[PDB]
Design a protein around this ligand. Sequence first.
Ligand SMILES: [Zn+2]
Ligand SMILES: [Zn+2]
Lengths: 47, 69, 244, 47, 103, 45, 41, 344, 49, 304, 95, 24, 27
Amino acid sequence: TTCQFLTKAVLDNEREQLDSPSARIVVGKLNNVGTGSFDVLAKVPNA
Amino acid sequence: MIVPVRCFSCGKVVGDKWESYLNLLQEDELDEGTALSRLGLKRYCCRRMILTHVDLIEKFLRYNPLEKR
Amino acid sequence: MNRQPTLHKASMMGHKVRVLPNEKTLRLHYANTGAYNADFDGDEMNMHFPQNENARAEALNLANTDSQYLTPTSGSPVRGLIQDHISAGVWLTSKDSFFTREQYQQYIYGCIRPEDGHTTRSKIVTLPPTIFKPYPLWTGKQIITTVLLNVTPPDMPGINLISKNKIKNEYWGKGSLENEVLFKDGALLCGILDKSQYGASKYGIVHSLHEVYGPEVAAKVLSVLGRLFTNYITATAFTCGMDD
Amino acid sequence: RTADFRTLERESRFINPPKDKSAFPLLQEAVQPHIGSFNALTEGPDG
Amino acid sequence: EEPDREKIKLLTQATSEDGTSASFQIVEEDHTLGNALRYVIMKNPDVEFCGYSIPHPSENLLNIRIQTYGETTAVDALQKGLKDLMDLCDVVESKFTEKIKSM
Amino acid sequence: TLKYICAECSSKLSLSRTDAVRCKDCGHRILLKARTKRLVQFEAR
Amino acid sequence: RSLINPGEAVGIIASQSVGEPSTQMTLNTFNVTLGIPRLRE
Amino acid sequence: TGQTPIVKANLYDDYGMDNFPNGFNAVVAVISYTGYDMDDAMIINKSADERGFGYGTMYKTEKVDLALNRNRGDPITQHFGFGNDEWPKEWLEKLDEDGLPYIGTYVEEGDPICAYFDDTLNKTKIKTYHSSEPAYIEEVNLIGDESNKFQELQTVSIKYRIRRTPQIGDKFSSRHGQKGVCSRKWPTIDMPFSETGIQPDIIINPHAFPSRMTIGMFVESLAGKAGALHGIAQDSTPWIFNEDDTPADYFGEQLAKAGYNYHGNEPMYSGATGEELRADIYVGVVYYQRLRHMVNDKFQVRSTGPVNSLTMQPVKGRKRHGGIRVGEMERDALIGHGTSFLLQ
Amino acid sequence: ETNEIGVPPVFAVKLTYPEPVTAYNIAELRQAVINGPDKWPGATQIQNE
Amino acid sequence: EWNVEKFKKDFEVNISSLDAREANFDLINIDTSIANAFRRIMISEVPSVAAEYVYFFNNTSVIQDEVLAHRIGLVPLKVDPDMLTWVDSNLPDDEKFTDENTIVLSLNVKCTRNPDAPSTDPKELYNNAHVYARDLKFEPQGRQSTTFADCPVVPADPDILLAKLRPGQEISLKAHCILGIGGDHAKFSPVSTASYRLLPQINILQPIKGESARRFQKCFPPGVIGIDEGSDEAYVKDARKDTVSREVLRYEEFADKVKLGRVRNHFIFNVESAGAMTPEEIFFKSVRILKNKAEYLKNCPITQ
Amino acid sequence: GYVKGRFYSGIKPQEYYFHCMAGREGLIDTAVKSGYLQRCLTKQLEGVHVSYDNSIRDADGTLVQFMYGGDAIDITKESHMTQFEFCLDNYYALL
Amino acid sequence: RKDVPKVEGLKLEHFATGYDAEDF
Amino acid sequence: ICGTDNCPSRLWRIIDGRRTCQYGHVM
Ligand SMILES: [Zn+2]
Ligand SMILES: [Zn+2]
């Protein structure tokens, strides 16, 4: 019931925080499970 | 279709022994087994090759689109 | 590699590409049969080729086949040899199975190739014969001892396990202990090897090796045994007939 | 003495298709409910 | 003249530092030469371990491992094996010619 | 030598453009394209 | 050293661990509801 | 190469099934030797396949109708043959002066299968042949257009002969429901050789029989062997034999009388080591059938092919260079491993 | 190997990986480029900077 | 201790029957690895001449071009090799086929009708109805058409049926016969069947004299078990004639009183030719191939 | 329906008909009879995972469990964890 | 119940490699 | 005609699965 849940979302003026695996797939964001449960940062020497 | 050239299992030429086999069954009035023995087929693989041959080519040839009736 | 329906994550594993010349079909080892629930009855499989290193690393370290030895459902094995290899093992590890120096060394190199990195000692170590006089003869169980002696690390001690067989002692005659699978310091000293040992069965020899030496060694043992029994079934065949 | 295969009989029939009653009546008896059914559409009693 | 290098190759990834043990890889060969060659190499009193292994049927390769005791390299044991197999075949060819005449 | 075999009477009779697609000898509307002399390479395998 | 790694999708794994073996109970009874109908309840 | 069964029910003759052979009598050994045969996989002999064992052909017919657009006797811009002044390079290699192809010509996908000229476009066009399997022209028929005659025969039925040798994947089965895919075409030198000097045409794995319980095949093996040696067909009609009058004893006596082992076994030697195998292998003559299906007819590979306008995702269609679907369950499995970059 | 898959050469000549050219792999990729898209191990395409 | 000269002392050859097509010889006190090697070579490695490239000009027969081409390849040609050089595959067709590398065989048959009183015989009813291997006419070309003057290219078996025809049908082809090995295709195997069987051994553990001796004698082929008298024990006259049916072991009175084995050193080879080379020539070439294989590796640089 | 006959000796015509009924019944059940059951669980549990604070948290951070099975053990590890004799015999290997 | 009729005059039609049907 | 900085030269060749310019590039 895609259009029904969408209607309920619009009427709530809801913000999809994109934190569910489904939502992330919809917007092309990396899934927060396993390898997506953290961030990788590079250590750079120059100030 | 026609008699296969060589026995599928070992490779003994069987294609020259088809018409000769029917002559041993018709004119000589021999049994299936003795006829194959006189042709020089002792292995059961070479034995079944001719013994089990259907020869559907004779049935197939009766349809000729190049000659009338 | 994917075999549909993908009912559990083990039905979608990461495999190492081995391009085989003059082939028209995807070739798969028998150890993978269980996890995919794939039988070679004209089954179809999907091959996905990920296009970046992060996706590569994942298919080589997380979803790779080596880590799937035990399923997370019950923590039991889903990897092992399936048919010829089981029948080969019951014959090879039987008391009646003896081998000459020439035969014995052949079975060793046949499944263990140092050039393919199967060894851990850079030289194929061999046990002395079980029969010295009159003729030098090796037992079938000694081949299983030698395969472990060359695939398990030299720094670690041999495996110690007291397991059981599917085949009851009554079948092997009077006073036999051939049901009791005995491994003392990595040496098969009693009992034959069934589906209960190198099949996808818990607390068997492969599972015991997996716990003591790790998943990489257990994989090596499975491939080594898989080759040994294939080579053994080629030299010493197995048949079924009306007499049976 | 046996339940043999017709080899001489077979090959002769392959070359000479019968001019009389066709061999293997059971084969025509197999399509008997089909042909018979359509035959009764015009032929038989009461037209 | 040019000697082909693809036929026989020494797998340095498995060859001993001493050279007493080595794995050789031969192309376009199988059980035919393989089992016959390991049999002859095994008759050598200096050969400790010898066997042959075909990596896979689809790939045209033949692997032969020769582990010896001291005072003989694996290369020498292979060269002796080939030299003896040639002489063995001469014996077979000589005895067969003689029995053809003896008939 | 252009050829067309009749399906019924088996007569080899070829016909050009602005002609009825029928055999001359008998009234048959189906014509088999005959095999002409042309090289066809084959492997005896 | 036997602890579950943070990030492990225990949710999917659980449903797969209940789903996959529930295929083996597709066969009928040999009073109470059993197999998939009871699991569905 | 059709063959008459040695082992058969007498009703096979009553229905004259010899007019349409469905299989071939093969030397089948119940052996686990190669290692490539196991449960659903069986081995075929290379030298047997090389000698034409189980060879088949597949005929496909196409209708090239020029009435596709014209209707109700409209004037036609189209016509079988070649138009003057306009002629793209090397088309005469496949088609004859009439625009129709030379019967016997080898064709691959992209090659011209026919030629015509339509006045509406004033250009000489061709109908292309497209299929993954190459073919040869077996029959070309020119058909009258009817419609009060007069009009030239554009229309035309073309028959393709597609040769089909047994490929790795093709299914083969005995008359006892024991089907298996071709795992490999094993060489005769590498094949196990009998005391007689025969190597089996087909290898069936012994691990197939304990689960299926196809004992009919087991008795068919010693019956087929007995009938091949003595040269007599045996009746395998159901309920002919009893508990007291066993067929295993009946054909067993026949096998002993011929000079073979009573229990249908044969002393076989290894093709690799050359040594005599541990025990005598169960060998006989079993009527095998080659199933019509290609092993992978659905065999495909896509790197970067066409995509649908709306979704911009690989389009559906094996022959169209289409994409493999990664469904909800595969999505679930990639979430399962916690493998977020594989899902991405 | 139990961790391997036998890939037919048909798939091997169609399935490609975008390998960035560097000093450590210039030798390996030069051969692939020479070999082309029908000789394995080859290359179907080259992407410039 | 095994020496190559110590092998010469024990190694024996025994020729039972040497016909123009098949030779039955024995190899005594030789290893399985050597006997199996010659066997493997005789089938797969001994080079032979067979049709490889069939060039069709017309085929109106019922038999498809592929099938008819394959049948010609299977027909063994009474052509001695060594007369032909090996064809090179890299250079093109115009340079590839020469008078030293290729042998040409033509087939040109056209079927017609004949007037005869009519079941009626196909040789009476039609002319050139049956196409035989003898209908493959040898066409010598190039630099040497005098080398095959006292050696005409004729199929080993001429009465081999190649095709069956009805009036109107025709076969026109040019077959290119080349040199090849049996490992590539079975059409190139010079042998019909090259196989060995180990000498059967019958180890009599008990004397088993009397009427049981006559019962034991019926378990083996006629010329195997010989009985001296009622007593004087039961001996093995010719263990070589044994079929190894194990019939003696399926009897309670003999199951423990006899053992059935083999002589691992003794091999009974049976070699039948397709017709090109004599069975001896095929065996000799097999030994020459094994020697050359070991020789080629001897004078070879061991790379890496 | 009690068949005294075996597949080696053969089945009496009367016995054989009975066997066929049993065989067909086995076949139909396989054709007639977990897809939707698993799909319903996976869509609601997809987000549920192990957090860095060892608790089982949903996609939106809501706590489902304070600890996996109450002990935080990976099932693919909980096998020889009670196999104390095994671990003892392989003390130095595991150490 | 009548037994399956055995085949009339069944002789040996398999021997060793270099041995024919000379032995009667 | 494609129209790319490159020049097509006409005679576009269709490859099943790939439509390429006879010359420089392929769609
Ligand atoms: Zn044969
Ligand atoms: Zn007409």
